[PDB]
Symmetry: D2
Subunit: 245 residues, 4 copies
C-alpha cells in the first residue's frame, strides 16, 4: 500500500489521476491539492509519493518542497531543461533516499516514438518534429517534442546538419531550433496531444506519429512510475528506464 | 499555334515544362533561357508567351522586361506579395493588351485545397497551415501556404482570433504569422511539395492535405494558363479564375 | 420550448446527448430510453421529438413507432440504405406533418468533407475512402464512408472507373466496393471516429481527413436538427440541407 | 568487380536499376533482359549476380534458372509466400555456393518500419496495416504489408486477437486477414509506394508511415545486397539481415 497525493488535482490531467488513484486497490489518495492549497497538506496527510500535473511556473517549487520532505515525486508537468534537471539533482544530494521521476510523456506510444526516433536518426539526411496540442497548453514546443529533438540530435552527433537552402523567410516559419532540429508547434481546438517525427533521405520519408486522443492514455505510465518510484533513488528522466526496450 | 519561351529551362520545374511544350501539338518552343542568358533571346525568337520558374530574386526583373515587350507571362516562381502584385499592375497600365497570370501552385489538388480552405474557415475556431517541401527551396513559407493563410484570414474577417494560451516558448515554435494564421515550413530530403490545412473546433478537426509527388503535376495547369493567357488582359492571380469552381 | 426524448440514453453518444438536452435552455428532456424500455414511455412523457443513437438492428422499428405516433425524429444510428430510406418515406405518406432527419454524421468537419468530396471528384482519376473507428462499432463500413462513396460515384457518373491493375489478391484486400469506390474500414482501440477521402491523378493526391476525437463533436449538429426538425415535413437525409453550403 | 544482370530492365524499377549499375564503378552491366528475352542471355554475358524486378507470375521460373546456373540473385519482385520460399530453399540444396536474397522492400524507411512494428506490437491491443500504391501494381496486398503483418502477428503470439465488434458488413470492408492482422490495399493514381502501420490501445494510437516518393529510394538497398550477396550462401529474406539493427 502507498499513500499518493496529486498536485493539480482539478486540472485536466490531474482530475484523471485522482480517479485512477482512487480506483487502484494498492494506492490510497492522501491529498488532492489545487492552486492556492499549501504544500503542508501533503505532510499533514502522511503522503509518501506525489503525482504532479501543474504548470511550468510552479513545478520547481513543488519539487523543492517534496525533496526536502522526503516525498517521492512522479512529475508530468513540462517546462524542463537541463539546468532544471541539474537543480533537481543538486537538491537530491541532501536527500539520498528520495526518488524523483520526471517524464514529458507517460503514454506508451510517445515513449516508443522517442525510442524509434533515436534508432532511425542516423539513416536519414533530414529530421524535424511537428507537435500538435490543444490551445490551453502553456509551453511551446511541448516537453515531448523537445526531448525527441534532443535524442535525434544526440544520435546524429558528427553527421551533417539537415540540408536547407532557405534564403528568404518570414520570422518563425522554420520552427524553433532544438539542437539543430526544427520543431513546430500547432495549437488547435479539438486536439489533445499529438506528435509527428519526420525523417527524409533520397526519394523517401519515414514518419512516426503518436496521438493521445484521451488523457486516460497517461494513466498506465503514471501508475507504473508511482508503483516503482522508490526502486531508483535520485532522478530518473523519462519513463523508458522503467521499461524493457 | 503559339510561340512559348521558358525561363528557368534547366531548373527542376522548368525542364519539365520545356518537355511539355515540346510535346504539345499546338505550342512551339521559341526560347529556353537559363541563368546568365539575356532576355533579348525571347524577342529574337519572336516569343508570344513565357513560362517562368526561376527564383524570387529575379522574377520581377523578368516581368518588367516581358511586360515592356508585350510578351504574356505565366509565372510559377514564388516570393510574391501584395506590393509586388501592385507593381506588376502598375507596369501593365502602360501595356493594356498584355496578360500576366501568377500562381503559387498549378496542381489541381492545391487549387482545390485553397478553395476548400476558404469554404471551411468560418466553421472552426482554429486554423493553421503546415507546408513541407524539398530542402532546395529558397522561400519559407511557400507561396501556396502564404496564399492559403491569406484566404483563411479573409474568410474569418470579424471572427475571433485562434485561441492560444502559450506563455513560455522558444523563438519560432509557433510558426510564421500570416494575417493571424500560423504557418509552419518543413524542409526535408525526400519530399517534393506538400501542404496540410488544419481546422479545429470542439471535439474535432478537419485536415485538407495536398501532395505533389512529381513535378508532372504542375504541367496541366501551366499549359491551361498558357493556352488561355490572352483571354484576360492585365493581371490574374491564381489558377482558380480559369476554372469552374 | 420542446420536449425531447433520447433513444439509446445510456450509450456512448446517447449519454452525451442526454447531457446536452438537459443543459439546453429551450429543450426539456421528456424520456431517456435504454434497451428493454418500451417505446410507450415516449408517448407517456408527451415527447415531441426524439434523438436516436441506438443500433442498426432496432432503428427501423423505432422509426416505425415514432412516425405512427407523429413524433419527429433526429436519427444518428447508421445501417441505412436506399431501401430503408424508401421504407421511411412510405411510412411518412400516412403522417404528412411528421419530420424525420437521418444523418450518418452530425460533426461539421464530416459534413464539409462530404461536400468537398462531391466538388473534387471529377478532377481525379482515382478515389477511395478509408474510415477508422473504435472497435465497438457494429457496422462496416461506417454510414459516413458509405455516403461519401455514393456522393463521389454520383459526381463521377460517365467518367472512367478507377484504374486498377490488380491480378493477384487476397480476399478483401481491396476493400468493399460502394458504387465503384473502394471503402476500407479500420477498427482500432484508441480511436473515436475518423475518415480520409483520397483522390489521385498524375503526380499528385488530395486527402480530406476528418477526425472526431470526442463525441461532443456531434452535439451542435444534433441540437440544430432538433431545433429545426419540424421546418421540413417528411424525410431529410444528412445535415447539409440545414446548412448554407 | 562484379558482372550484374537486370531482369525487368525496361520496367519502372528495373530501368532505375540499370542506370544505377551502369553508374557504379565496381559493377559492370552484363545483361538487360526484358519480357520475351531468353534467360540464356545471362550465361552468354558471364553474369555473376542478377537483380530481378519483374512480375509475380515469372519470378519463380527466373529463380529456378538462376540457381541451377549458380547465378546469385537479388530479388525485389513480390508475390512471395512461405511455400515459395521453401521451394527456393529446396532448389538451393543442389547449389550450396549460390546466394539468393529476396526482399519486399529495399527502402530503408520500410525496413525500419518493419523493425519498429515488431518492437511495438506487444504494447497495443489493436494492429492493422494500410498500404497505398500506384494503380499499375499487380499484387494486393503488397509484399511489404504482408511481411509487416506477419511480423506483428509473430510478435503477438499468445496475446488476444484485435478487438472487433463488427456484426454487419459489406464484403471486403475489413481488409484481408494476414495471420489475424487486417491489411487494406489502396490503389491510387499519383502514388508510388506507401504504408502505414497502425497500433491502438486505450486513449492512444501509434502510426509508423513510410513513403517512397521516387524509385531511387530502392537503389541503395539493392546495391548493398548486390555487393554483399555472396557473403551468405543460401536464402536471405529481407534486407534487415545485412544491416545493424
Ligand atoms: N507527462 C505527460 O504525460 C503529460 C500529459 C499531459 C500534460 N502534461 C503536462 O502536465 C501539465 C498539466 O497539464 P494540464 O493540461 O492538466 O493542465 P491544466 O488543466 O491547466 O491543469 C493544471 C492544474 O494545476 C493547477 N495548479 C496550478 N498551480 C498549482 C499549485 N501550485 N499547486 C497545485 N495545483 C496547481 C491548476 O490550477 P489553475 O488552473 O487554477 O491555475 C490546474 O488545475 C502541463 O505542464 C502539461 O504540459 C504532461
Ligand atoms: N507555381 C507552382 O506550381 C510552382 C511549382 C514548383 C515550384 N514553384 C516555384 O518555382 C520556382 C522554381 O522552382 P524549382 O524547384 O524549379 O527551382 P530550380 O530547380 O532552382 O530552378 C530554377 C531555375 O531558374 C534558373 N534561373 C535563375 N535565374 C534565372 C534567370 N534570370 N533567367 C533564367 N533562369 C534563371 C536557375 O539557374 P541556377 O540554378 O543556375 O541559378 C534554375 O535552373 C521557385 O520559386 C518555386 O517556389 C512553383
Ligand atoms: N450520426 C452520427 O453523427 C453518429 C455519431 C456516432 C455514432 N453514430 C451511430 O450511432 C449509433 C450508436 O453509437 P454508439 O457508439 O453510441 O453505440 P452504443 O454505445 O452501443 O450505444 C447504443 C445504445 O443504444 C442502446 N439500445 C439498443 N437497443 C435499444 C432500443 N431498442 N431502445 C433504446 N436503446 C437501445 C444500447 O443498449 P445496449 O448496449 O444494452 O444494447 C446502447 O446503450 C451507431 O449506429 C453509430 O454508428 C452516429
Ligand atoms: N522490393 C522492393 O523494394 C520493390 C520496389 C518496387 C517494386 N517491387 C516489386 O517489383 C516488381 C516490379 O515492379 P515494377 O513497378 O517495376 O513493375 P513493371 O514496371 O511492370 O516492371 C516489370 C518489368 O518486368 C518485365 N518482365 C515481365 N516478365 C519478364 C521476364 N520473364 N523477363 C524479364 N522481364 C520481364 C515487364 O515487361 P512487360 O511490362 O512487357 O510485361 C516489365 O518491363 C513488382 O513485383 C513490384 O511489386 C519491389
Ligand atoms: O510533451 C508535453 O508537453 C505534453 C505531453 C502530453 C500532453 C501535454 C499537454 O496536454 O499539454 N503535453
Ligand atoms: O507554393 C510554392 O512555393 C511551391 C509550390 C509547389 C512547389 C514549390 C517548390 O518546389 O518550391 N513551391
Ligand atoms: O458514419 C458512422 O457510421 C459513424 C459516424 C461517427 C461515429 C460513429 C460511431 O462511433 O460508430 N459512426
Ligand atoms: O511491397 C511491395 O509489394 C512493393 C514495395 C515497393 C514498391 C512496390 C511496387 O511499386 O509495386 N511494391
Ligand atoms: Cl535543455
Ligand atoms: Cl532521503
Ligand atoms: Cl521516455
Ligand atoms: Cl502580402
Ligand atoms: Cl500591350
Ligand atoms: Cl488558385
Ligand atoms: Cl443503398
Ligand atoms: Cl402527421
Ligand atoms: Cl451531410
Ligand atoms: Cl505465407
Ligand atoms: Cl553452387
Ligand atoms: Cl527487412
Amino acid at each position: 500500500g502507498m499513500r499518493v497525493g496529486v498536485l493539480g488535482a482539478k486540472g485536466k490531467v490531474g482530475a484523471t489521476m485522482v480517479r485512477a488513484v482512487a480506483a487502484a486497490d494498492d494506492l490510497t489518495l492522501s491529498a488532492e491539492l489545487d492552486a492556492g492549497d499549501p504544500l503542508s497538506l501533503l505532510t499533514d496527510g502522511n503522503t509518501e509519493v506525489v503525482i504532479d500535473f501543474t504548470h511550468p511556473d510552479v513545478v520547481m517549487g513543488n519539487l523543492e518542497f517534496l525533496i526536502d520532505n522526503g516525498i517521492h515525486a512522479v512529475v508530468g508537468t513540462t517546462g524542463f531543461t537541463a539546468e532544471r534537471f541539474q537543480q533537481v539533482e543538486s537538491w537530491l544530494v541532501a536527500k539520498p533516499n528520495t526518488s524523483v521521476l520526471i517524464a514529458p510523456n507517460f503514454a506508451i506510444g510517445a515513449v516508443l516514438s522517442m525510442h524509434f526516433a533515436k534508432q532511425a536518426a542516423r539513416f536519414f539526411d533530414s529530421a524535424e518534429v511537428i507537435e500538435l496540442h490543444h490551445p490551453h497548453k502553456a509551453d511551446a514546443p511541448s516537453g515531448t517534442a523537445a526531448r525527441t529533438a534532443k535524442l535525434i540530435a544526440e544520435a546524429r552527433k558528427g553527421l551533417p546538419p539537415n540540408p536547407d537552402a532557405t534564403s528568404t523567410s518570414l520570422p518563425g516559419a522554420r520552427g524553433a531550433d532544438v539542437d539543430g532540429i526544427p520543431v513546430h508547434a500547432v495549437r488547435l481546438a479539438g486536439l489533445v496531444a499529438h506528435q509527428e517525427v519526420l525523417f527524409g533521405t533520397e526519394g523517401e520519408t519515414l514518419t512516426i506519429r503518436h496521438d493521445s486522443l484521451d488523457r486516460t492514455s497517461f494513466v498506465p505510465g503514471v501508475l507504473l512510475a508511482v508503483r516503482r518510484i522508490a526502486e531508483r533513488p535520485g532522478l530518473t528522466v523519462g519513463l523508458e528506464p522503467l521499461l524493457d526496450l
